Write a protein that binds this DNA or RNA. Structure first.
Lengths: 100, 49, 54, 142, 297, 49
RNA sequence: CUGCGCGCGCGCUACACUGACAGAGCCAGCGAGUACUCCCUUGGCCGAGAGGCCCGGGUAAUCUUGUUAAACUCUGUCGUGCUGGGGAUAGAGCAUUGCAAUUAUUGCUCUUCAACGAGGAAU
């Protein structure tokens, strides 16, 4: 289920460097799936091959082991500031400045 | 006159334009009174866990 | 609330707790009909199973 | 039979407890007792003169009958109407020095305790023990 | 009883909405009847509607009856117009003063069939409840500022309109001495209305002249010795209450017997005094741009 | 000296109650908008009519 | 003191013993309440009081608030005396609101302790 949520959010994962076909059904889980692994292209084996410290178990573990997790955290904190912009801590501060 | 007899031009800091930081206005939810919320009928009764 | 039939009868009234009054409910009286959180009173055999697991 | 203080009427209980806290001789009394008023909403000081025991007994029972109470609730409870002379009556809170010092006195005597877990002051387990015991004593005079 | 009042008010509102749609159709049907009698050619959108002709053949006769005035419009007053004597009680605000209670007595004596009620501790929904329980036609509430009245609230029952008005220039009956005034005659008063021309003016004329009992129409043009005058200028209806003798066939001596107002209405609501959420019909539009230029009534 | 001196409170556009003297509005002749209809006072010609 | 045309009107508080005071009992209902903010505020200390202070729950049948409101009920003190009825006027002090409190915003303390002994004719 985490892997399927990641597959429907793979536009967000590559942060604008690579956009994807907007397939948005109501249920992201298909009826028939099978989690497999790329084996080997015999023509390319020096850089088209994940190493032992990068062959992880799930897809979300590969996304987290990749870079730009700080980029996700930066975008999340910008969204959090924009959504805490004027909601209720702002009004608590206004009420305290009036009462002082 | 001001440059000759050495008096600065009058400038009000409350009058000089500034940038205004507006937080996004979020309002409180609806606060239904207890007597009305206990008197209104079953199909429209408020369900709060 | 003004145009309410005092003799209305839905069948959810046999599976819901009404808003009551301040006298019947008490200090914890809001006009909202209380809903279920999903918990349920759990029989002894299943709690025997859960406590063996714990 | 078994007993609480809820099985004993207000005045004969609070008077029995007043006579007990008085007899005991352990109590703290601040010292500004006698020379003090109870509230800004009053005209004269109390007429019992030594009377801090009456409020101590009244406070301690009030706390026994419920979860937790703070100084603010007691000031509000023990306050009444002030005549503003020729302008309408209004309710006015009583003094928080009286009640807070009573609470601290009765805390040091181990008949109530702080309840920072929720706020205020809760009845002590030894406060339940002594209050239920004098409540029994009151019914044993009758 | 209460279920009947609610049901009849809902039926009245539904019938009024159906009358709006039927008036939108019957403005088209009156062109077809006038073109049939006079032969002037009419619009094709009117002459080529088969439903309109097919229903026009049944609904001629109510249009003819409305042209002759043989029927009366669906109204809250047309049910009991000149059949029942409208009973009406006058009440104060909650803790009245002595001049407000004497003023309440004076405007009770203005109506020959009114009664006055002491408020005391009387909750306003139970006041409405007791009015519908005793089949009163009208209630009139009074509000004072400091021994001088500042508002009337004329509410028609069972579900009729409120007219809330503010009073100005009130000269009480209770200021002049008993040597000069006296006991007011209680005869059925003539009424005159001067300056009401809009349909809103005819609305307020209806809800003011259905407060008084109906006059016997056999010889009313010469008999009766007491008149009540509602005349408006600048939509502030000013009311006098006179008593008269006809000292000749060409002259008449008036004598001011009652209080003088210039009440200005500020709210006419299609719903009784309890309903604060009733749909208003008109309200005094202050704080608009041309609300002081435009004159209603 | 008049051009360099401070503007009067009538020539400043926003005159709050701290600037001017106490009853200084009574000496001025300003026009302003009113709101709503005034009530017509009953005069003797009105009562006669 | 509004309003109407030292004079006037609506009022508040009293002249006490069906009371004042002091303890003590202890009971409502209609309300309201803080976002781009300082609203309704419990409890903990400090303070005689007014208040201060540290936290805290609430955009609310959820927290204030059971709004423990007042007359009221009881056990006392006072004893008909302008008396402890009454609390005007006045001095001195401490606080809170507010940029500002003098012509005293309001709050508390001490003191000062006026008229008023049921209102007349009338209405």
């Amino acid at each position: 289920k985490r892997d399927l949520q990641l597959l429907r959010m793979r536009d967000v994962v590559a942060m604008g460097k690579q956009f994807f076909k907007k397939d948005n059904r109501k249920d992201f889980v298909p009826e028939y799936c099978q989690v497999g692994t790329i084996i080997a292209g015999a023509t390319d084996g020096v850089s088209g091959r994940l190493t032992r410290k990068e062959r992880k178990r799930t897809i979300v573990e590969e996304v987290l082991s990749s870079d730009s997790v700080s980029k996700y955290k930066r975008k999340y904190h910008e969204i959090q500031e924009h959504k805490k912009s004027g909601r209720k801590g702002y009004y608590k501060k206004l009420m305290a400045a009036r009462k002082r | 006159i001001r440059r000759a007899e050495n008096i600065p031009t009058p400038q009000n800091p409350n009058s000089t334009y500034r940038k205004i930081e507006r937080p996004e206005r979020h309002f409180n939810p609806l606060r239904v009174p207890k007597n009305l919320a206990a008197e209104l009928p079953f199909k429209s009764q408020i369900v709060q866990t | 609330a003004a145009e309410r039939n005092e003799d209305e009868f839905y069948f959810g009234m046999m599976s819901r707790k009404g808003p009551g009054s301040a006298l019947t409910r008490g200090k914890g009286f809001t006009g909202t009909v209380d809903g279920d959180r999903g918990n349920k009173a759990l029989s002894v055999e299943t709690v025997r199973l859960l406590k063996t697991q714990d | 039979g078994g007993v609480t203080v809820r099985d004993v009427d207000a005045h004969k209980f609070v008077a029995a407890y007043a006579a007990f806290l008085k007899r005991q001789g352990k109590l703290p009394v601040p010292g500004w007792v006698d020379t003090v008023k109870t509230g800004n909403a009053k005209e004269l000081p109390p007429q019992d003169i030594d009377w801090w025991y009456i409020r101590a007994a009244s406070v301690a029972r009030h706390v026994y009958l419920r979860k937790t109470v703070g100084v603010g609730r007691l000031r509000k409870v023990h306050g009444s109407a002030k005549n503003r002379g020729t302008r309408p009556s209004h309710h006015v809170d009583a003094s928080g020095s009286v009640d807070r010092k009573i609470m601290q006195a009765l805390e040091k005597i181990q008949v109530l305790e702080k309840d920072e877990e929720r706020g205020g002051r809760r009845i002590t387990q030894q406060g339940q023990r002594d209050l239920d015991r004098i409540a029994q004593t009151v019914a044993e005079a009758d | 009883m209460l279920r009947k009042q609610a049901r009849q008010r809902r039926d009245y509102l539904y019938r009024r909405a159906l009358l709006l749609r039927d008036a939108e159709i019957a403005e088209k049907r009156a062109k077809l009847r006038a073109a049939l009698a006079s032969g002037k050619p009419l619009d094709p959108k009117i002459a080529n509607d088969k439903e309109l002709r097919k229903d026009f053949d049944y609904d001629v006769s109510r249009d003819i009856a409305k042209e002759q005035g043989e029927i009366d419009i669906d109204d809250e007053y047309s049910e009991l117009s000149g059949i029942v004597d409208p009973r009406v009680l006058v009440t104060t605000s909650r803790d009245p003063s002595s001049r407000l209670m004497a003023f309440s007595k004076e405007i009770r004596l203005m109506f020959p069939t009114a009664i006055r009620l002491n408020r005391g501790n009387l909750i306003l929904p139970d006041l409405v409840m007791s009015a519908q329980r005793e089949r009163l036609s009208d209630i009139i509430l009074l509000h004072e500022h400091r021994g001088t009245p500042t508002a009337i609230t004329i509410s028609h029952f069972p579900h009729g309109p409120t007219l809330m008005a503010s009073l100005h220039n009130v000269v009480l009956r209770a200021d002049i001495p008993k040597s000069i005034k006296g006991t007011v005659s209680e005869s059925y008063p003539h009424l005159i209305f001067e300056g009401f021309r809009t349909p809103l003016g005819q609305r307020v004329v209806k809800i003011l002249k259905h407060l008084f009992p109906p006059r016997d129409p056999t010889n009313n043009a010469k008999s009766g010795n007491r008149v009540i005058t509602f005349v408006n200028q600048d939509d502030c209806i000013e009311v006098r209450h006179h008593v008269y003798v006809r000292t000749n066939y060409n002259s008449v001596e008036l004598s001011e017997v009652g209080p003088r107002f210039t009440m200005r209405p500020f709210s006419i609501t299609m719903g009784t005094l309890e309903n604060k959420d009733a749909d208003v019909e008109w309200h005094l539009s202050q704080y608009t741009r041309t609300g002081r230029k435009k004159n209603y009534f | 000296a008049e051009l360099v001196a401070k503007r009067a409170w009538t020539l400043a556009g926003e005159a709050t109650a701290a600037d001017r003297p106490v009853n200084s509005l009574l000496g001025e002749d300003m026009e302003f908008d009113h709101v709503g209809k005034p009530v017509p006072v009953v005069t003797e010609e009105v009562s006669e009519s």
